[PDB]
């Protein structure tokens, strides 16, 4: 995992995708952010 994600958080997904690379790249699955 690149960074910790939060299903309850809506703005968290933003970072989850960034850590993976850029806006739109990556995905938020569970407590951890999984990059597609």
PDB file of C-alpha atoms in Angstrom:
ATOM      1  CA  UNK A   1       0.000   0.000   0.000  1.00  0.00           C
ATOM      2  CA  UNK A   2       1.222   3.485  -0.910  1.00  0.00           C
ATOM      3  CA  UNK A   3      -0.885   5.234   1.732  1.00  0.00           C
ATOM      4  CA  UNK A   4      -3.702   4.600   4.245  1.00  0.00           C
ATOM      5  CA  UNK A   5      -7.191   5.041   2.796  1.00  0.00           C
ATOM      6  CA  UNK A   6     -10.545   5.713   4.460  1.00  0.00           C
ATOM      7  CA  UNK A   7     -13.891   4.501   3.116  1.00  0.00           C
ATOM      8  CA  UNK A   8     -15.648   7.004   5.376  1.00  0.00           C
ATOM      9  CA  UNK A   9     -13.467   9.776   3.954  1.00  0.00           C
ATOM     10  CA  UNK A  10     -14.464  11.275   0.602  1.00  0.00           C
ATOM     11  CA  UNK A  11     -11.500  13.622   0.177  1.00  0.00           C
ATOM     12  CA  UNK A  12      -9.126  10.830   1.193  1.00  0.00           C
ATOM     13  CA  UNK A  13      -9.545   9.116  -2.176  1.00  0.00           C
ATOM     14  CA  UNK A  14      -7.936  12.187  -3.738  1.00  0.00           C
ATOM     15  CA  UNK A  15      -4.603  11.408  -2.076  1.00  0.00           C
ATOM     16  CA  UNK A  16      -5.013   7.659  -2.580  1.00  0.00           C
ATOM     17  CA  UNK A  17      -4.907   8.279  -6.331  1.00  0.00           C
ATOM     18  CA  UNK A  18      -2.031  10.753  -6.052  1.00  0.00           C
ATOM     19  CA  UNK A  19       0.202   8.352  -4.125  1.00  0.00           C
ATOM     20  CA  UNK A  20      -0.355   5.839  -6.927  1.00  0.00           C
ATOM     21  CA  UNK A  21       0.800   8.406  -9.467  1.00  0.00           C
ATOM     22  CA  UNK A  22      -1.660  11.092 -10.497  1.00  0.00           C
ATOM     23  CA  UNK A  23      -5.281  12.221 -10.349  1.00  0.00           C
ATOM     24  CA  UNK A  24      -7.356   9.303 -11.598  1.00  0.00           C
ATOM     25  CA  UNK A  25      -4.603   6.729 -11.147  1.00  0.00           C
ATOM     26  CA  UNK A  26      -5.258   4.215  -8.383  1.00  0.00           C
ATOM     27  CA  UNK A  27      -8.202   3.027  -6.300  1.00  0.00           C
ATOM     28  CA  UNK A  28      -9.417   3.016  -2.695  1.00  0.00           C
ATOM     29  CA  UNK A  29     -10.196  -0.464  -1.373  1.00  0.00           C
ATOM     30  CA  UNK A  30     -10.705  -0.904   2.358  1.00  0.00           C
ATOM     31  CA  UNK A  31      -8.532   0.776   5.013  1.00  0.00           C
ATOM     32  CA  UNK A  32      -5.568   0.647   2.634  1.00  0.00           C
ATOM     33  CA  UNK A  33      -5.208   2.305  -0.771  1.00  0.00           C
ATOM     34  CA  UNK A  34      -4.696  -0.187  -3.599  1.00  0.00           C
ATOM     35  CA  UNK A  35      -3.327   1.155  -6.885  1.00  0.00           C
ATOM     36  CA  UNK A  36      -5.100  -0.380  -9.880  1.00  0.00           C
TER      37      UNK A  36
END
